[PDB]
Amino acid sequence: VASGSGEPREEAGALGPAWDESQLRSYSFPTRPIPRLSQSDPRAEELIENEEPVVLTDTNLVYPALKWDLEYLQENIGNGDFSVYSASTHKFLYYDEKKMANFQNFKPRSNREEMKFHEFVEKLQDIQQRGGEERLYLQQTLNDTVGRKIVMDFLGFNWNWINKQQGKRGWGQLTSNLLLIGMEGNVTPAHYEEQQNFFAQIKGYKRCILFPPDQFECLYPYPVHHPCDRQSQVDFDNPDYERFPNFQNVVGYETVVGPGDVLYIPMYWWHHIESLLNGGITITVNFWYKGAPTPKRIEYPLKAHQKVAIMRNIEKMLGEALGNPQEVGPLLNTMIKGRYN
Amino acid sequence: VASGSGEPREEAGALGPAWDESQLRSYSFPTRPIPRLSQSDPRAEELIENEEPVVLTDTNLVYPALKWDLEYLQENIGNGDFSVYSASTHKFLYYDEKKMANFQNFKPRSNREEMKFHEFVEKLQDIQQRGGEERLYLQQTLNDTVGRKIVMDFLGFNWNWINKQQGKRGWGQLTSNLLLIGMEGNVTPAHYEEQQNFFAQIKGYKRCILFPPDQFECLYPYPVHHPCDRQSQVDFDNPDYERFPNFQNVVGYETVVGPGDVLYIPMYWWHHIESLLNGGITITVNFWYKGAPTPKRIEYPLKAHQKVAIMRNIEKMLGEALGNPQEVGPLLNTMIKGRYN
Ligand SMILES: O=C(O)CCC(=O)C(=O)O
Ligand SMILES: O=C(O)CCC(=O)C(=O)O
Ligand SMILES: [Fe+2]
Ligand SMILES: [Fe+2]
Numbered sequence: 001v002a003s004g005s006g007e008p009r010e011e012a013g014a015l016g017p018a019w020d021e022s023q024l025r026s027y028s029f030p031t032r033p034i035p036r037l038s039q040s041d042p043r044a045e046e047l048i049e050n051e052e053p054v055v056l057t058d059t060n061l062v063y064p065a066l067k068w069d070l071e072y073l074q075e076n077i078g079n080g081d082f083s084v085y086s087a088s089t090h091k092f093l094y095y096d097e098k099k100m101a102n103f104q105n106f107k108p109r110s111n112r113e114e115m116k117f118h119e120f121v122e123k124l125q126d127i128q129q130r131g132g133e134e135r136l137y138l139q140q141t142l143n144d145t146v147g148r149k150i151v152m153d154f155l156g157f158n159w160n161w162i163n164k165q166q167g168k169r170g171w172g173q174l175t176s177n178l179l180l181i182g183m184e185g186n187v188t189p190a191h192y193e194e195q196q197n198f199f200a201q202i203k204g205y206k207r208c209i210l211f212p213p214d215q216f217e218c219l220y221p222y223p224v225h226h227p228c229d230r231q232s233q234v235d236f237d238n239p240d241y242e243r244f245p246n247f248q249n250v251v252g253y254e255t256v257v258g259p260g261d262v263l264y265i266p267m268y269w270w271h272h273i274e275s276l277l278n279g280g281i282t283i284t285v286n287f288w289y290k291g292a293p294t295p296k297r298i299e300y301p302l303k304a305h306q307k308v309a310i311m312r313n314i315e316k317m318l319g320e321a322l323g324n325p326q327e328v329g330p331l332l333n334t335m336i337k338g339r340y341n
Numbered sequence: 342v343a344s345g346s347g348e349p350r351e352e353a354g355a356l357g358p359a360w361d362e363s364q365l366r367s368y369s370f371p372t373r374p375i376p377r378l379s380q381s382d383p384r385a386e387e388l389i390e391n392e393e394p395v396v397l398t399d400t401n402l403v404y405p406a407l408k409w410d411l412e413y414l415q416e417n418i419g420n421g422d423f424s425v426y427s428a429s430t431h432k433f434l435y436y437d438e439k440k441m442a443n444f445q446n447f448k449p450r451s452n453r454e455e456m457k458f459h460e461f462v463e464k465l466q467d468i469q470q471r472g473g474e475e476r477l478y479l480q481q482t483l484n485d486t487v488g489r490k491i492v493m494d495f496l497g498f499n500w501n502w503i504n505k506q507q508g509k510r511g512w513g514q515l516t517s518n519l520l521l522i523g524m525e526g527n528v529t530p531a532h533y534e535e536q537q538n539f540f541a542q543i544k545g546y547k548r549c550i551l552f553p554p555d556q557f558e559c560l561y562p563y564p565v566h567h568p569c570d571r572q573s574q575v576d577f578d579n580p581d582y583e584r585f586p587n588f589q590n591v592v593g594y595e596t597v598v599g600p601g602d603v604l605y606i607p608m609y610w611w612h613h614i615e616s617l618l619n620g621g622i623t624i625t626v627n628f629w630y631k632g633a634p635t636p637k638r639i640e641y642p643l644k645a646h647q648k649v650a651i652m653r654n655i656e657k658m659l660g661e662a663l664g665n666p667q668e669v670g671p672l673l674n675t676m677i678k679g680r681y682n
Contacts, residue, residue, distance in 0.1 A: 220679040233679070244679050300664040310662050311676045314655060321651050323641040329681035335652045336677060338561040338574070338585050340670035 002030040005207065005256045018258055019205050023276040025187070027236055029247075031209060031254035034263070039161070048169065051266040053210050055255050059262045062200045062285055064156035066259055069203060070181075070281070073150070074121050080145035081114045084123070085137045090274075091187045091237070092137055099227040102325050106227060124183070137188075138181040142285070162198060162287060171196055172290025180284045182275045190219060190232040190272040192308075195288040197265035201257040204275060204282035208263055210253045211270040214304035216311075218246040219270055224315040225325030236272065267291050268305040343371040346548065346597045359599055360546050364617040366528070368577055370588075372550060372595035375604070380502070389510065392607040394551050396596050400603045403541045403626055405497035407600055410544060411522075411622070414491070415462050421486035422455045425464070426478045431615075432528045432578070433478055440568040443666050447568060465524070478529075479522040483626070503539060503628060512537055513631025521625045523616045531560060531573040531613040533649075536629040538606035542598040545616060545623035549604055551594045552611040555645035557652075559587040560611055565656040566666030577613065608632050609646040 005024070008017040036055040037044040047054040085092055087110045095108055115123070120138055127134055142154065166174070175195060184204075190211070199208070211219060220243075222228040234240070239247050256276070257263050265271050275282040294306075302310075318332070319325045346365070349358040377396040378385040388395040426433055428451045436449055456464070461479055468475055483495065507515070516536060525545075531552070540549070552560060561584075563569040575581070580588050597617070598604050606612050616623040635647075643651075659673070660666045 217675050217678070223680060246679075298664075302663065307663075307672065307675075310659070311672070314659065314676065318651070318655065322643065322648075323639075329677075331648065331652070332673070332677050332681050334558050334648075335655065336670075336673050337558070338587075339564060340673050 001032060003033050004031045004254050006033050008256070009258075019256060019276050019279060023205070023279055024207055024256075025237075025274060025277070027209075028239055029250045029252055031252040034208075034210065034253045034255040036255070036261070045168075048165070048264050048266075053253055053255075053266060053269060054264050055257060056262045056264070057260065059161055059200075060158045060260075061162060061198065061262045061287075062157050062202055064153040065200075065202045065283075065285060068153070068283060070121050070124075074117050076147045076149040077117050078145050078147040078150070079116055080143070082117055082120055082138055082140045084113050084115055084120050085139060086111050086113060087135050087137070088133065090135065090185050091189050091235075092135075093189060093228060093231065094191070095227040096229060097227075099225060099229065102225055103227060120181075135183050135186060137183070137186050138179070140179050142177045142179050165198070166289060169196070170292035172292070175288045175290060178286045178288070180282070180286070182282045182284075184275055184279045184281065185277050186282075187236075187274040188272070189236060190234070190270050191230050192221075192268050192270045193230070193265070193288070194267060194291065196267045196291055197289075198287040199257070199263040199265050200285050200287065201261045201263070202259060202283040202285060205256055205258045205279050206282055206284065207254065207256045207274050207276060208265075209272040210265065211250060211272075212253075212304065213268040213270075213308055215250055215270065216304070216308055218244075218250040220244050220247070223325070223328065224312055225319055225328065232270070268308055342373060344374050345372045345595050347374050349597070350599075360597060360617050360620060364546070364620055365548055365597075366578075366615060366618070368550075369580055370591045370593055372593040375549075375551065375594045375596040377596070377602070386509075389506070389605050389607075394594055394596075394607060394610060395605050396598060397603045397605070398601065400502055400541075401499045401601075402503060402539065402603045402628075403498050403543055405494040406541075406543045406624075406626060409494070409624060411462050411465075415458050417488045417490040418458050419486050419488040419491070420457055421484070423458055423461055423479055423481045425454050425456055425461050426480060427452050427454060428476050428478070429474065431476065431526050432530050432576075433476075434530060434569060434572065435532070436568040437570060438568075440566060440570065443566055444568060461522075476524050476527060478524070478527050479520070481520050483518045483520050506539070507630060510537070511633035513633070516629045516631060519627045519629070521623070521627070523623045523625075525616055525620045525622065526618050527623075528577075528615040529613070530577060531575070531611050532571050533562075533609050533611045534571070534606070534629070535608060535632065537608045537632055538630075539628040540598070540604040540606050541626050541628065542602045542604070543600060543624040543626060546597055546599045546620050547623055547625065548595065548597045548615050548617060549606075550613040551606065552591060552613075553594075553645065554609040554611075554649055556591055556611065557645070557649055559585075559591040561585050561588070564666070564669065565653055566660055566669065573611070609649055 008019050010016070011018055034053050034055050035043070035047065036057050039056045039059045044054050044056055089109065092110050095110065100106060120136070124136060219232045220234055222231055222233055234244050234247050241248055255263065315328060318328050322328065322331060349360050352359055375394050375396050376384070376388065377398050380397045380400045385395050385397055430450065433451050436451065441447060461477070465477060560573045561575055563572055563574055575585050575588050582589055596604065656669060659669050663669065663672060
């Protein structure tokens with residue numbers, strides 16, 4: 001019951017296992033599977049209602065994007081600019097650029113490079129043609145600049161289903177759809193979002209490991225003013241148990257998504273996302289929504305995400321009040337040592 | 342220059358030393374003297390302006406109370422009720438009774454007993470008449486119930502001088518005058534107030550050891566929701582250097598006040614106050630004032646007292662937001678461990 005993603009699934013038409021376990025990276029912690037359910041299944045509505053993750057196998061959320069692949073996209077996506085992240089390791093740590101002002105003892109290991117889609121397909125082409133070690137990850141918000149066919153594709157997504165979802169959950173407005181295109185083996189390490197997320201897998205296979213918000217103590221997010229806010233400081237490949245002792249208690253929910261699957265990633269759930277090894281390129285489109293309004297007014301006992309939201313707001317104000325985010329830590333220490341520990 | 346209170350002072354009319362060093366308790370930390378100045382001395386106005394302590398030797402702030410002693414007071418103070426604190430040790434730790442609700446794993450070592458002045462003089466009389474170990478400390482806000490002569494005494498205090506002080510400093514309104522009557526050897530252990538304080542010594546001799554607000558890290562105040570809020574957790578007689586390691590770095594300002602001296606105790610300065618051993622009873626009246634309005638608006642770098650005020654407000658809100666003061670500590674810990682330490 002520390003199973004993981006379970007035995008792989010059998011493709012339709014006897015096409016053999018979609019993937020196998022040697023495509024999965026190995027970690028220090030155990031996992032239990034996220035349930036794969038039909039969208040008509042009351043249990044799946046239960047999970048989303050309760051803000052627990054679920055993999056919906058038949059939404060058709062992005063049915064028209066299933067034909068997408070690089071040739072189609074290059075052909076049809078337009079000449080807009082695309083954010084492409086670079087890296088020498090498999091782990092793409094994200095940096096918030098606005099936050100980089102107030103941390104100088106920071107340098108990147110992943111640079112954003114703006115480029116046209118064909119330049120991406122191309123940069124992508126040079127690297128394989130020469131066996132390079134390097135890696136790229138395109139991640140760009142879909143918007144109005146995109147070509148006529150992609151727009152027809154987009155309009156054909158299952159808005160009726162996801163709008164009913166937005167409605168039933170009291171969510172706010174859709175903030176963005178991000179288009180993600182990755183190389184095999186790319187990892188987006190563990191982090192959380194403040195939005196609700198339907199994560200709609202289009203091409204290839206991604207393993208998604210989620211941790212609930214009550215595992216905050218085991219995952220050690222960066223300081224809120226740090227550029228890696230909301231990301232774990234823990235290197236999942238080489239965990240430093242002396243700095244991060246509660247990582248030894250972390251327990252995850254795990255699944256592998258393929259073409260057609262939608263993974264509900266609930267607000268504040270940590271997620272770690274890796275494109276299978278030797279699985280080829282992956283494509284995904286996500287759907288971020290604001291999140292229902294905080295109830296006027298509060299009921300106890302608070303949920304884990306609400307305690308998180310509180311920690312963030314304390315860090316933020318202290319940032320403002322002290323005039324400088326760098327003084328947040330010494331102040332907090334002074335506040336607890338010999339007082340609350 | 343770790344001098345302390347200096348060589349004792351010589352009473353007028355060759356009456357020999359007012360007190361001597363064997364009347365002073367001994368502690369683990371060093372001290373430098375607080376300056377004793379005349380009220381007309383520009384340097385004394387400098388210190389108060391800068392919120393540094395100073396002992397003013399000639400204010401006449403409470404000239405008419407200098408004749409006070411127990412017989413006079415019993416005779417003249419009326420039949421109102423007087424708060425009298427009790428104790429088996431020399432250290433009178435104060436408890437805030439409103440706060441006792443939310444800490445049950447608390448019992449007192451100092452009970453407030455309401456009683457008439459003559460009952461105090463009397464309880465006081467039984468104990469000496471029989472050589473008891475016990476101790477009392479009367480501490481009661483002067484108010485309208487007091488007898489005609491005490492009121493004449495009070496009206497004769499030097500309002501012209503202290504009102505000019507209130508005015509020059511932009512202080513708010515006088516909140517209370519507390520009347521303190523102690524037995525020789527009584528200690529009010531280290532704590533801070535949020536008000537400004539002119540501490541006006543009337544009978545006997547008190548040693549006052551002050552620490553500036555920037556020594557917060559060395560003095561380990563109780564949690565703000567604890568009943569001993571604003572008091573040091575450190576036992577000055579037996580300091581626990583394992584829980585309170587920064588106590589080994591504490592440095593104090595020290596003085597001995599006698600009849601006629603006024604000690605300015607600035608807002609947020611820690612003070613520890615002991616009535617000299619074998620010095621007899623002490624009498625003091627203080628004058629608490631609100632404190633100038635926080636500037637609209639803030640200028641950096643912040644002063645130590647302002648960082649303190651911030652720590653308090655964080656603890657308070659977290660108290661409110663979590664629904665329970667008991668959860669403040671675990672939350673703060675979760676926030677810093679592996680994150681800010
Ligand atoms: O696919 C990825 O690697 C990133 C996905 C993600 O973090 C998200 O959709 O919130
Ligand atoms: O005289 C004492 O022991 C207490 C005085 C004091 O703490 C004050 O006036 O703020
Ligand atoms: Fe994410
Ligand atoms: Fe005090």
